[PDB]
């Protein structure tokens, strides 16, 4: 009983850190998209 | 049997955290490489002006 409650708590902590890593991934993807938007407008200026 | 269930779930959640780090490392690497390409593109902007 004691060790099962401890291991479920550890699994929940890894799930918490996993959700934090998910948020970090979504933020990096948002930065990639916005910087690529800047690069697209720069390529339009390059066509000009 | 719950110990067996914990051994079957803990490792999967750990490997999922490792896969989240895989996406983090690869997207952060592409962001750093894109910032370097932004520096070279700024040199191309200098070529533009």
Technique employed here was cryo-EM
Kindly state the tokens that stand for B7: 């051994």
Resolution (A): 3.5
On whether any CB of chain A is under 8 Å from the CB of B15, the answer is no
- Round to whole Å and give the CA distance between A43 and B15: 40
Q: Would you put residue A26 in left (φ > 0), alpha (ψ -120 to 50) or beta?
A: alpha
Phi/psi of residue B10, each to 5°? Answer: -65, -45
Interface test with A, best of B13, B19, B28, B46 (most A CBs within 10 A): B13
Write down the residue that tokens 């490997």 correspond to.
Answer: B15
């Amino acid at each position: 009983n004691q060790h099962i409650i401890r291991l479920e708590s550890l699994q929940a902590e890894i799930k918490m850190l996993s959700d934090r890593k998910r948020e970090l991934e979504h933020r990096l993807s948002a930065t990639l998209e916005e910087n690529d938007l800047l690069q697209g407008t720069v390529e339009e200026l390059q066509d000009r | 049997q719950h110990i067996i269930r914990l051994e079957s779930l803990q490792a999967e959640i750990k490997m999922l955290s490792d896969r989240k780090r895989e996406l983090e490392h690869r997207l952060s690497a592409t962001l750093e490489e894109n910032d370097l390409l932004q520096g070279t593109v700024e040199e191309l902007q200098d070529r533009v002006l």
